[PDB]
Ligand binder design. Structure first.
Ligand code: HEM
Ligand code: HEM
Lengths: 422, 55, 442, 101, 49, 49, 220, 52, 54
């Protein structure tokens, strides 16, 4: 019976990529990764990307709003849409026997929407709700304002449709947005758990809107702003970053490591991270409850790097200043050759575990098959990661201390410092 | 409470919500006059019937 | 193909150490993995005065052992990129680690060092005392949990299962270095534990390491005796915690379930699959296949609802929970009980066909990663005394039909006195008697 | 030949709603399908229909009609709602059939 | 690691209105790992990182 | 906190069969209901007469 | 007063001296009309440097005098009009606070011609910080101001508001001739330097409306 | 001129929508609307709300 | 309306005055006479008709 397969990855004339695998898992998971997000919006059609996310269940030219749901549920399948500020992923899941069935809808949803005015209209008030739940975590509110203060465009765009635009988006804006961004050369049809020949037959033999790179995102321009939201919360959230590195950038791996060297999220339930210089550094400065971490984001043509904190309103000053010294102290050779070795594995481990999940795996095989064109070897990634010098790390730390910073706060800020007091 | 005692009173609210502020189509013809006549007729039959029943 | 892929799944190797401990694993091609110990111990095992020990313990289980103090222990775990986490329920506790297949052996040593040599430093205990007290005040603001505790508190009033896992305020304030030690000694024992591992590890190499750090063998016959707990009595009753100052109401209603062993649990889960669950962000909206979800959407009955089949060794809770605005509680409850009666009296073959497919996808999803496969193994052995494969589960599931679901649901639901927990602005929901009548006549 | 067409245009004129300025679709009894269909109408078509109806009701109350010139002509009667209505019914049947088997 | 996450059946929902952390324990791991993702499912809750 | 809350003792009111906190109350269920439903059914019969 | 008023003397709470930040807050809200203000720290109440900005104000244009007319005595307005072609408005903004002040301009324009309008409003401030102030512009403004001040006291509310604002921040009533005397004693230089203080000082800005074409404080 | 205004029976009211909240088309119906100076705020027990 | 006891113009009446009608939890037996008076009345009418017929 079955054994070891190989990750094939064709590409058609129109530029549509097709990555496939086969771990003989009892369940298959297919996705449609697309270079499209809130980054391609303009003051004119803001939020349209968000609504497009919620509109996945609307009627298509091949299947009705009704059949899409009753049809997918009928085979115990699922259908979801995850999207960042510059990528959208439509993926479905089901048992191996029903992939074909569930596929019809995935095809229809991403290539043949109808955006009927009334369906669209009844749907819009949902943006209001969907946003309200997401914003329950203060975490999400500050990252919206962070990107805002950090940029002047593209990435500066919010991930959740602004309030003033709720109910003002049109079927036209949806259609145009889908025509100018969901183009074959910007799309990839990944799929774990199926023979590569079938996933290929589906793609070519079915997809329409195509050929080209339609709308192009106006290169992101760093601003370095400072947005502060006084809202009474006893817990102040704050983020201070600097332009970091882009995706695939050689300087990428450096920050990733500088990240783990400073502390990138707890590993022992209720434990006080020791391998975390930033945390340990903060704890020495404050005495009340808190949290602090290395923040790192890699975007197509830019990136963000810095730290994120949470603390009682009064001990906000000490916590952020402390978090800073810990970044300067590292920009000053304060990085042992060992800290670099801990982090190095700490990272290969994190990356590695993060791919046990069918979602994590597909998300990996996909992100590459789209931004690249092929699959890197898990040994290359590890090889590229340890090839990072103790200097690479220290310099990354300098780029932060030297570069222009942008900050975003939230909560009772009466004791929180201004970017120019750091 | 309600300003006019025609909207609030549990009884005058009834006489009102069915014979005074009741929304009726602007164009019903005379063929819509029979319901009231039937009613009035009924009250009339009962009155004359009682008067006769007493003898 | 589905049928076959289920077979190719690598079997679960199980071997017991002569000291009572069992060792099981499922080997994959994966470079990363998870291993941990699943103990048959929780709040149900505690008493009036030591309620919470298992939890107070869970907090110290990571503050280091005697073989190596706090800073050392942590440093040693972190610096090798392994994740150390765990939990403690009512009838089950577990500490597991996530790391690279390589470290497998050093991991075991650490697991063993924790379950056996927890330092229980006394300066640490006076610190966790405040930490726990805080977590109680934080968790006290999570209505969903406040509600399931109240459900248990009344459903099994006057028994062990009626206790919270975190214990009481008084106990946390007065538990002793002694009690905690006593808890560990009395409960964390070889025959009541299971070493589970999932990922790219060799059973052989695994069991070897076990024998090495999981030594201490028993002399008497009592040390190899796994105590059977005193049965908990179910009670049809209700607890209503009213506070009109709360935004939305929480309602949880349930009947007594069979308990792990019983095959009916399969059917019950298929049943729950028919009623399903729902929350205001489900894109399917008015078209969801779940009749209750649909009505919920049509009439705006709730912010969310979920069905549950919480199993235990000898008992259980089969019910549902919903969150809704103060003025829609009644209708929601009404439609919900309705769907239950529909289960006992008119379930169709169409509804079951789908319920099965939803359930199959659900069981497969519980095996997505090493940590969840490890959790399954730990619990299967501990609860079913062995592992039940997807190939077997599926067989059981395929056997269920409309006829069956009706008979099983009628058996546990029809004309029964449920347990009810209601928290928040609950004035519109009322009278146990009325709720009770909802238990009969479709 | 043109038999059906002659009959249709005959009936259309015999019916007489065009004398009130009503479009054939303005005269549909509002059952459930029509109720839904109307909700899907674009604002402008909806308001135009609304005025036509309020206009007929006012004529009806007055016991008058429109001047011959203003009567809707058979070939100029816009069947604005029929496209929507047919779809609403198309969806309903699908759901109906799907909930059976 | 071009993964937007690797740098950066089930599911539980929630509810709010429109129109608590008190110790280093119930806060740690809540400091923006990396980018913010957003999901929506036609059958499962909404999520955000 | 809700953890400090427990259901009072209903011994003074419990029927015998479910008085023991360690015995399955399900075994005497059909009994306790059969009785009360018998009373009701009888009232019906009397009323029907 | 005597026979009644209680709440004992003193000064209880004291305001923590205002600290300049120089931030930039932008509100994207879809409006077809963009409002924007760009200022710098200016004169404080009763400050010596005060009267200078008041005049630089009227020299640049501080609110229309002819119904539906195109202010000519308004360099800022006239300067803007030459740059844009669609409807708009632009004025000199001036605020005097106890321990600080604000000064600059405020504009309103169609979203697309927002760029040209604000840049144009800027050059007019720089061009003034470069001797671009005639000895006459200073004379016009001077009276333009004495007139404004004077008229603004015909209203019982305006009068009481004058007699009060002084009797509180000062202790006595200045003579209407002293105010006028203090105002014209402003040199052509005082004005030009005030203009420089603006061009040199750190600016803070605030926008609102569809800002897709509105510039950032660092693009000026 | 220490007046906060001189540097920055009658009266007509208005009304909006809450919950969330809730025309100028020529240089004429806009001129004189560019913040003269600070911002004042008034409230009367007998008249409309004022703002400058 | 989900349950036809709340929406129906007639069953809504029987319901809103004899089934879901909110009553004080502690009214004594002295509150039992209203219904008796009612039943009595329907009873008098029924026996009266039967007698009036002879
Ligand atoms: C729906 C209302 C009623 C109708 C349709 C009605 C009709 C009639 C008819 C057709 C007759 C025979 C008339 C004849 O002599 O040719 C009659 C007679 C009579 N009705 Fe009525 N009646 C009504 C109500 C009443 C009521 C309410 C009473 C009693 C309070 C009443 C008392 C009598 C009596 C006493 C006679 C016999 C004397 C007579 O023949 O004129 N009726 N009724
Ligand atoms: C409020 C309800 C009523 C009351 C309080 C009532 C009371 C009485 C009383 C005190 C008598 C005399 C009984 C006796 O001592 O013989 C009587 C007789 C009678 N009632 Fe009524 N009655 C009521 C309703 C009715 C109705 C609705 C009818 C007719 C449909 C009716 C028909 C008669 C007749 C035929 C008699 C005469 C025969 C007899 O004396 O038994 N009653 N009623």
């Amino acid at each position: 019976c079955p054994g070891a397969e190989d990750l094939e990855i064709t590409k058609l004339p129109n530029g549509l990529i097709i990555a496939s695998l086969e771990n003989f898992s009892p369940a298959s998971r297919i996705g449609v990764f697309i270079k499209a997000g809130s980054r391609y919006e303009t003051t004119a059609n803001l939020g349209t990307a968000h609504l497009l996310r919620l509109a996945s269940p609307l009627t298509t030219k091949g299947a009705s709003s009704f059949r899409i749901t009753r049809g997918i549920e009928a085979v115990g399948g699922s259908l979801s849409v995850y999207s960042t500020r510059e990528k959208m992923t439509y993926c479905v899941e089901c048992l191996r026997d029903h992939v074909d069935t569930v596929m019809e809808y995935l095809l229809n949803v991403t290539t043949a929407p109808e955006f009927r005015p009334w369906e669209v209209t009844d749907l819009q008030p949902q943006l209001k709700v969907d946003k309200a739940v997401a914003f329950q975590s203060p975490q999400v509110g500050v990252l919206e304002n962070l990107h805002a203060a950090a940029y002047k465009t593209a990435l500066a765009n919010p991930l959740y449709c602004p309030d003033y635009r709720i109910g003002k988006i049109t079927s036209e804006q949806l259609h145009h947005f889908v025509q100018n961004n969901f183009t074959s050369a910007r799309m990839a049809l990944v799929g774990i758990g199926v023979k590569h020949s079938d996933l290929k037959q589906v793609a070519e033999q079915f997809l329409n809107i195509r050929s080209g790179a339609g709308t192009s995102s106006a290169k992101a321009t760093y601003w370095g702003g400072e947005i502060r939201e006084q809202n009474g919360h006893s817990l102040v959230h704050a983020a201070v970053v600097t332009e970091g590195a882009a995706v695939g950038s050689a300087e990428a791996n450096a920050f990733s490591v500088l990240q783990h060297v400073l502390g990138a999220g707890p590993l022992i339930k209720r434990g006080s991270s020791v391998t975390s210089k930033l945390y340990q550094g903060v704890a020495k400065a404050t005495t009340q409850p808190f949290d602090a971490s290395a923040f790192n984001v890699n975007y197509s043509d830019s990136g963000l790097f810095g730290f994120y904190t949470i603390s009682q309103a009064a001990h906000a000053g000490e916590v952020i200043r402390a978090a800073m010294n810990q970044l300067k102290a590292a920009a000053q050779g304060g990085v042992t050759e060992e800290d670099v070795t801990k982090a190095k594995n700490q990272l290969k481990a994190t990356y590695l575990m993060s791919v046990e999940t069918a979602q994590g795996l597909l998300n990996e095989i996909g992100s590459e098959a789209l931004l690249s064109g092929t699959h890197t070897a898990p040994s290359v990634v590890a090889q590229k990661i340890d090839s990072v010098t103790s200097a690479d790390v220290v310099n990354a730390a300098k780029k932060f201390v030297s570069g222009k910073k942008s900050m975003a706060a939230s909560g009772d800020l009466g004791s929180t410092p201004f970017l120019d007091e750091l | 409470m309600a300003p006019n005692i025609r909207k609030s009173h549990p009884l005058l609210k009834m006489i009102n919500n069915s014979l005074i502020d009741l929304p009726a189509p602007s164009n019903i013809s005379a063929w819509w006059n029979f319901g009231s006549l039937l009613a009035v007729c009924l009250m009339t039959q009962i009155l004359t019937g009682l008067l006769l029943a007493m003898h | 193909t589905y049928a076959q892929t289920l077979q190719n799944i690598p079997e679960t190797n199980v071997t017991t150490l002569d000291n009572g401990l069992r060792v099981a694993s499922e080997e994959s091609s994966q470079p990363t993995c998870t291993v941990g110990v699943w103990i048959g111990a929780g709040s149900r095992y505690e008493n009036e005065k030591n309620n919470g020990a298992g939890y107070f313990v869970e907090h110290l289980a990571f503050k280091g052992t005697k073989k190596r103090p706090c800073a050392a222990f942590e440093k040693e775990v972190e610096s090798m990129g392994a994740h150390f986490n765990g939990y403690t329920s009512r009838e089950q506790t577990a500490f597991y680690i996530k790391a690279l297949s390589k470290d497998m052996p050093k991991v075991v040593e650490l697991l063993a060092d924790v379950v056996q040599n927890c330092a229980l430093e006394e300066s640490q205990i006076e610190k966790e005392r405040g930490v726990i007290l805080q977590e109680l005040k934080e968790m006290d603001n999570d209505m969903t949990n406040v509600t399931f505790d109240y459900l248990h508190a009344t459903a099994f009033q006057g028994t062990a299962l009626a206790r919270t896992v975190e214990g009481t305020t008084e106990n946390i304030k007065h538990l002793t270095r002694a009690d905690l030690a006593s808890y560990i000694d009395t409960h964390f024992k070889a025959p009541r534990m299971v070493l589970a591992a999932a990922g790219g590890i060799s059973h052989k190499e695994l069991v070897d390491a076990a024998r090495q750090h999981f030594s201490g063998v028993s002399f008497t016959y009592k040390e190899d005796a796994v105590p059977i707990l005193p049965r908990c009595r179910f009670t049809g009753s209700e607890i209503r915690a009213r506070d009109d100052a709360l935004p939305v109401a929480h309602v949880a209603l349930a009947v007594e379930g069979p308990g792990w062993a019983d095959p009916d649990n399969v059917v019950l889960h298929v049943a729950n699959a028919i009623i399903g669950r729902y929350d205001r962000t489900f894109g399917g909206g008015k078209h969801l296949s779940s009749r209750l979800a649909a009505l919920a959407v049509e009439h705006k009955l709730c912010h969310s609802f979920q069905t549950f089949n919480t199993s235990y060794s000898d008992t259980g809770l089969f019910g549902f929970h919903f969150v809704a605005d103060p003025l829609s509680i009644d209708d929601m409850m009404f439609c919900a009980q309705g769907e239950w009666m529909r289960l006992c009296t008119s379930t169709t073959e169409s509804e079951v066909k789908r319920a099965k497919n939803h359930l199959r996808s659900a069981m497969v999803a519980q095996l997505d990663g090493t940590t969840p496969v490890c959790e399954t193994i730990g619990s299967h052995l501990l609860n079913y005394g062995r592992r039940i494969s997807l190939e077997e589960w599926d067989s059981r599931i395929s056997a269920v039909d409309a006829r069956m679901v009706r008979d099983v649901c009628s058996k546990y639901i029809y004309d029964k006195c449920p347990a009810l927990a209601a928290v928040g602005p609950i004035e519109q929901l009322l009278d146990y008697n009325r709720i009770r009548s909802g238990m009969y006549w479709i | 030949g043109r038999l059906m067409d002659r009959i249709r245009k005959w009936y259309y004129n015999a019916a007489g709603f065009n004398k009130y300025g009503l479009m054939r679709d303005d005269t549909l009894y509002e059952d459930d399908d029509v109720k839904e269909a109307l909700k899907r109408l674009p604002e402008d078509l909806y308001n135009e229909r609304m005025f036509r109806i309020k206009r007929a009701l006012d004529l009806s109350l007055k016991h008058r009609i429109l001047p011959k010139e203003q009567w809707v002509k058979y070939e100029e009667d816009k069947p604005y709602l029929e496209p929507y209505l047919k779809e609403v019914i198309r969806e309903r049947l699908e759901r109906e059939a799907w909930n059976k088997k | 690691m071009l993964s937007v996450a690797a740098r950066s059946x089930x599911x539980x929902x929630x509810x709010x209105x429109x129109x608590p952390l008190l110790c280093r324990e119930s806060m740690s791991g809540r400091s923006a790992r990396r980018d913010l993702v957003a999901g929506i499912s036609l059958n499962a809750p909404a999520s955000v990182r | 906190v809700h953890n400090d809350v427990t259901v009072p003792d209903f011994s003074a009111y419990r029927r015998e069969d479910v008085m023991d906190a360690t015995t399955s109350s399900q075994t005497s269920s059909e009994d306790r209901k059969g009785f009360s439903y018998l009373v009701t059914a009888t009232a019906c019969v009397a009323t029907a007469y």
